[PDB]
Amino acid sequence: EVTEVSIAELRDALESGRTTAVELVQAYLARIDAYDAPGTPTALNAVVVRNPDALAEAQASDARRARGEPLGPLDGIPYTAKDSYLVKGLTAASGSPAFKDLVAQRDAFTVERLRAAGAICLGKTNMPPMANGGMQRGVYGRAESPYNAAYLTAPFASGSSNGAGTATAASFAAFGLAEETWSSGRGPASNNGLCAYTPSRGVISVRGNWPLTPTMDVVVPYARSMADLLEILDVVVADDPDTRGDLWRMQPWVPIPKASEVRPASYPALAAGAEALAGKRFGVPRMFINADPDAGTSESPGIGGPTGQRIHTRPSVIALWEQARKALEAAGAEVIEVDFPLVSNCEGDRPGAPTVFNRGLVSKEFLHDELWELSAWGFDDFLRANGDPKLNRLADVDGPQIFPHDPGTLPNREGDLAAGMDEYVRMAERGIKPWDRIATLPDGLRGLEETRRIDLEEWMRRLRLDAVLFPTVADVGPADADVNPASADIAWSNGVWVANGNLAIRHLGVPTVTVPMGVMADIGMPVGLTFAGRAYDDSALLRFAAAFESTGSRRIVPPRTPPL
């Protein structure tokens, strides 16, 4: 039985003969065929592309082990990867019809590390087209929640790793791989009671990952426990000699430390009990716990959509935060209610607060380049680097098919995305400039880091804060949010459409660690607790999250996917 089993217990069974790599692959496939495939009562639709060589790779794992030569701690451990990941031999559509026949000619760096370690990819998980959204249906549709069919498995507007969240929580594999541009990593993890880690810039190479916004894309591993997440990072986190596609590891204007310089000697050693929280100071933004009436009191708040508006947290989510704060205080930690200039100075939600568009730290022309010229190059250079003879140029892509609207669903609120994605093909036909010749890049990248220094780094120092904590999301949107107007208003509200922090978290290179905060008593939906801190302080944040996880049993098995 593999339901809610840890990597250590699986490796333990592999070394004792109680199971084999092949038998683990078959155990997970039985749960996929019983809960994930179409025609089943649940039909969660998380695993959308199968790896036909999973059994062949599993047989090779048992052959290496029978010979007393395991490749390492993850030899024979199944996992899933977001459809944005390049997995050699399999398609890489990014959930988009226009790329449905694109074949990965090689692996992504995270997949290359796992394959060399003997880990076997069972398949790829669902996502909206190009990760440009959350719960919108792509070429493979969308994934459903294993905790409550009446609610989404991820934020509707930014939660593109919805398949990775559902699959990991339902034990369709030992762990999962996700990706985040806004909240596509923290979002799905929150609704499924998962542990997630968004690293600082350049810690995990994004080479071989379908980009969305090269300045913000990061690799996000999923795990049902902090122990499992540390098992994963111990293998994937390593220096990558090939920097192609990774903008932050290519640019020379801003210094970025090597991954081998940021990572600890042993990630599993970062685990600790409640002692790691004694004498620590943690700040919780009032805006994420229904304690900031000043949010949204400016003349024209926000920078588009529901940004810059007051967040109404669900009462059942407040009750879990109250018990989470009590656990922190009982462990000797100090929780302080504070402002959050990182969000307020980005969205201009109160009088005097500037926005990223008018503050002057980054030019307006860079923000234009950041989402048009720079992203079009990201799409084009990814196709050129992969090198599929059938499709290796963005100019040769069916534009209108990159993100076609789902007929019968409510129109997108941010704006039209069918013609918006086709525009990137128009730019590729007129000529795309590469990353290193975009004039606004040197000032923009230095301005992004400076923004974090003022709003977060120096801010945390003068407040003597060790980390910043807050509920990952304020509420969950109903599953019918795509067709029900009443549900759309809930799902598209601030704090719900996107995990707390909106774009400023990923825009400024802020590391985060998310852990389950508990399950809502009313609707039985999990909600997470996010730990954020200074850049490249990742080891401390991972330790804090592991310490908080040890003080409670805040994860349950999804009721829709019981053990077979």
């Binding site: 440009n132 959204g133 959350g134 930014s158 920078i303 990223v356 568009f357 950041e370 941010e414 774009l503």
Partner: peptide
């Protein structure tokens, strides 16, 4: 909700 700052 997904691309850069818009």
């Amino acid at each position: 909700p997904p691309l850069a700052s818009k």
